Design a binder for this molecule. Structure first.
Ligand SMILES: Cc1cc2nc3c(=O)[nH]c(=O)nc-3n(C[C@H](O)[C@H](O)[C@H](O)COP(=O)(O)OP(=O)(O)OC[C@H]3O[C@@H](n4cnc5c(N)ncnc54)[C@H](O)[C@@H]3O)c2cc1C
Ligand SMILES: Cc1cc2nc3c(=O)[nH]c(=O)nc-3n(C[C@H](O)[C@H](O)[C@H](O)COP(=O)(O)OP(=O)(O)OC[C@H]3O[C@@H](n4cnc5c(N)ncnc54)[C@H](O)[C@@H]3O)c2cc1C
Ligand SMILES: [Cl-]
Ligand SMILES: [Cl-]
Lengths: 431, 431
């Protein structure tokens, strides 16, 4: 009597989770609203920790990540670097070693395509936009109603459907602010420049490495791309007014609008913004900071990834946090599956809820700390004090807070998470 | 071009290894001398620690195992029990709690079958009995010559070919005694009886549990099989004689032969043997104890499983040791593959040699410890002093050591082993 999971959302997280459930023999379907791939071209990076979590899910996920990424002498180490972006000094401020393969990078859309090829045929159903969830009794199945009029029936449901998750709206009600993300009152300009232009502006050292330029109420990050032939610029600025409601979270923008937010900043940084194309993009930064979930699960329904805890991206690890969710959910459902072989329907369904109950108990604190921490480190990158020449030593003490908060993300003990998860599941079963 | 690995031997360790390596993108071939009747219908059991290693090699390995056993209101803990076999007292002497699914049991032939279905097509080559190995410069492929006159060319070679390993003889020499196992001067009778007989003879509590009966110079172990409808008997006895040269290691025997080794034992136990069939098998027990490998590896050849370290089966975990081998070799070769990806053929082949070097450094002590330990616990099960009631405190005092040695096996820290093996690989490359 096999265990059927309906995953709503075929993004990175829903697909990584599907891979882990299917390699363990659980019947999975992924319902994806789109009709093919998306996020076509962007870089993403995973901590060495998240990569090990991927490997426990199915080692093939890690082959997929490396298939989708990028001479003699030694092996390179991975460094976060911060640079002073306001003053003319533009002095190197801090640096953090993450180690050999401390981060592993890939093209999102090509990683996700590699992932889908790892799953059996028939796992992913496209053009299934979940509209309504119907919950009957715990011993009965959960019905998913899609916008095309088809239904589907599954023993349990997982929301992997992103920052605007419909599973979240079902749990907390389509009219709750808890069901929607909200503006962080910051937005970002993104564009590319040639590697030649980046060296003029910054020097060769700075142009061929990831650097965050800090400053008052704004900050700018760049790193090389396309075999070091170009450099990506992402520049983050403060917005006082509400993000217009019903207004799209992307939209075109102009090089010169970017430049106006950095006019008082040092000259290498301004030359970089000027080297961008005339037309570039503006991305609002939303998250679940203001109305975080009261619970990641209830009954036979569970939230994972951005659906549970969308973050602003100032740690560059939001998916990693979702990869832990997917490990923890995959391990619990295998324990449900082995530990209820041959028991009655009543027993199998209370196991499912008991496990989801443990998932929430185990994940919600780290996940919702990470959402807070993302806003926090962004604050520290944009302190007004960076501009005060009397306060650039109070301001330069944030780097210990960044190291500790970084390390707390990178050195997650996922094995103790899995051990505590199994204990809480047994506990929750009167065992 | 991917790293290629020729595994000699399609037993449980060689096929587990292959699964772990292909799931990571390494191009594998398994060469098995046998036609494809494969394993015996006997049963084996795996510690929860070995099962976690299985998961990390490939989660479908554990699925192959749980689907290759039977199906078991609260959850059953796994206990090992020792009883006095030599007096009619039949007193329960000791008990080790191994926890929920502390062991996971299967049928060997059903597992190896499931495992091979997991593998991609085109991996296991049957009727390929290795005869010679031709090594050349580190930078060249290794040539495997088979008895059908055919050849194969692999970047590196693993010996998964068992207690009579041919890869072992190439390393140490056909006429070296390090190339061969040797007799442990004990052998086992094996056969089945009904649960009805077993209850009638031992009583229901013992008949339906695993118990070991200790006594002088022999011991007996029984456990339910075939979904508690029968009981398997394994009776071990001592043999002062040598085992005849090239006499086969299995042989037919009689319930009456086995009964005479236990004539002085307690009644219920002699009744168990009387209930066996009239014809039963006699299993000689050889190991690598007298002449243990001086090294598991050399150049681009590496031994694993029973080839490296076969043992007498008195911890019932010798294939667990092999799965650790398999995980360590798999994690190392995966590290060779990512870290030498776009480098010269010299670096890649040196990296293999450095990985096989690390394997030997981190595995040999624990596995040669285990071989010795297997003989040692048998000597404690078979103390002459079990016979003398005045020496009872001394005899029973043995179980602390059994506890220590069992916990050393079951609590293996495979995460530190792997980190140790990665550090040693990097040190061996010159870093
Ligand atoms: C600029 C930026 C840079 C980032 N860089 C990194 C990084 O380097 N490393 C890292 O770890 N994280 C990074 N993150 C965070 C990371 O991208 C996200 O955490 C990750 O995409 C979340 O995965 P997901 O599957 O939960 O959500 P999504 O990617 O949003 O997938 C949700 C899926 O569900 C579908 N869907 C939505 N609604 C429905 C519905 N009703 N019915 C059916 N399907 C539905 C959607 O089409 C989509 O396929 C970054 C984020 C941003 C914004
Ligand atoms: C009675 C008994 C009970 C046991 N119970 C347990 C248990 O409960 N739990 C546990 O973990 N372990 C147990 N063990 C130990 C376990 O069975 C062994 O450790 C394990 O079988 C070794 O696996 P392997 O793949 O290295 O060797 P093998 O299983 O011996 O496979 C070796 C393969 O290589 C093939 N081969 C040999 N030579 C060549 C050649 N030249 N060319 C090509 N192929 C070749 C062979 O035909 C064979 O298929 C038990 C052992 C015994 C005797
Ligand atoms: Cl992020
Ligand atoms: Cl054994």
């Amino acid at each position: 009597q096999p265990l059927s999971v309906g995953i709503v959302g075929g993004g990175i997280i829903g697909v990584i989770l599907a891979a882990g459930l299917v390699r363990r023999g659980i019947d999975v379907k992924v319902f994806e609203q789109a009709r093919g791939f998306r996020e076509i071209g962007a870089g993403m990076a995973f901590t060495a920790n998240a990569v090990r979590c991927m490997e426990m899910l199915d080692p093939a996920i890690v082959w997929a990540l490396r298939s989708s990424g990028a001479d003699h002498q030694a092996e390179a180490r991975d460094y976060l670097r911060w640079v002073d972006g306001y003053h003319e000094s533009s002095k190197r401020l801090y640096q953090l070693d993450a180690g050999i393969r401390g981060f592993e990078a890939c093209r999102r859309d090509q990683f996700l395509e590699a992932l889908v090829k790892v799953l059996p045929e028939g796992i992913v159903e496209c053009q299934k936009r979940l509209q309504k969830i119907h919950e009957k009794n715990e011993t009965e199945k959960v019905t998913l109603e899609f916008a095309d009029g088809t239904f589907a029936h599954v023993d349990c449901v997982i929301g992997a459907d992103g920052i605007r998750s419909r599973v979240r709206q079902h749990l907390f009600g389509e009219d709750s602010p808890y069901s929607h993300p909200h503006y962080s009152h910051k937005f970002a300009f993104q564009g590319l420049i040639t590697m030649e232009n980046a060296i003029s502006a910054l020097g060769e050292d700075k142009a061929r490495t990831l650097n965050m330029h800090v400053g008052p109420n704004a900050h700018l990050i760049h790193y090389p791309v396309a075999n070091e032939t170009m450099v990506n610029i992402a520049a983050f600025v403060s917005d006082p007014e509400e993000w217009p409601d019903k207004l799209s979270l992307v939209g075109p923008a102009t090089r010169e609008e970017a430049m106006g937010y950095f006019a008082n900043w040092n000259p290498g940084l301004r030359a970089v913004l000027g080297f961008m194309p005339e037309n570039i993009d503006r991305w609002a930064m939303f998250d679940t900071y203001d109305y975080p979930a009261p619970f990641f699960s209830r009954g036979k329904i569970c939230l994972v990834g951005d659906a549970a805890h969308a973050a602003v991206p100032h740690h560059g690890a939001g998916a990693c946090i979702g990869i832990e969710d997917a490990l923890c959910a995959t391990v619990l459902l295998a324990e449900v599956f082995v530990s209820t072989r041959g028991k009655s329907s009543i027993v199998r369904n209370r196991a499912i809820a008991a496990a989801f109950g443990s998932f929430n108990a185990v994940r919600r604190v780290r996940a919702q700390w990470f959402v807070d921490s993302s806003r926090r480190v962004c604050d520290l990158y944009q302190q007004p004090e960076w501009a005060d020449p009397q306060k650039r030593i109070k301001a330069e003490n944030c780097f210990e807070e960044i190291k500790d908060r970084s390390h707390k993300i990178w050195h997650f003990d996922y094995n103790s998470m899995l051990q505590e998860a199994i204990e809480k599941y047994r506990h929750n079963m009167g065992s």
